[PDB]
Amino acid sequence: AKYSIDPTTYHFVTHLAMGPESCKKCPKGYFQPNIAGTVCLPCPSGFV
Amino acid sequence: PVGGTLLRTFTPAAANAVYVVDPSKYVLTLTVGPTSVTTADQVTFTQT
Predict the structure, then answer these.
(1) Phi, psi at residue A41, to the nearest 5°?
(2) Chain B interface includes A19 (CB < 8 A)
(3) A to B CB pairs, distance under 8 Å
(4) DSSP labels for B5-30?
(5) CA-CA distances (angstroms) from residue B9 to A21, A30, A47?
(6) Cβ-Cβ contacts under 8 Å for B11 (sequence gap 6 or more)
(7) How far apart are CA A7 and CA A28, in angstroms?
(8) Which of A2, A13, B34, B47 sits 20 to 30 Å CA-CA off B2?
(9) Residues of B with Cβ-Cβ distance to A23 under 8 angstroms
(10) How far is B10 from chain A (nearest CA, A)?
(11) If 0-12 CB within 10 Å is exposed, 13-18 middle and 19+ buried, where does residue B30 land?
(12) CB contact set of B34 (below 8 Å; sequence gap of 6+)
């Protein structure tokens, strides 16, 4: 807010994956098989 | 390490809190006797 206070990172950066706590897990009814895990696909048409 | 459960939470607890100080804000004066005097002349520290 100041332009004097020490900056954490660049301006255009808005979100960051700080630490492993960021790795939240999918809710029930959503599977995510891959490792990267960009998005959690909903369980398709009947499987649970 | 990851997630698990919370076990304890410490607290600053009423005036044992960390306080951050700006060293540039402190202002000091020394004003102790002369400067050019020789080994003969005693310099006087005026504590008041």
Answers:
(1) -70, 135
(2) no
(3) 5
(4) ---------SS-------GGG-----
(5) 18, 34, 42
(6) none
(7) 39
(8) A13
(9) 2
(10) 20
(11) exposed
(12) B41, B43
* CB proximity B20 to A under 8 Å: no
Q: Which residue has the tokens 């009423």?
A: B14
Here the tokens at position A24 are 């939240």
> Which residue matches tokens 């044992």?
B16
Give the resolution in Å.
3.9
Experimental technique behind these coordinates: cryo-EM
Nearest CA-CA distance, residue A45 and chain B, Å? 32
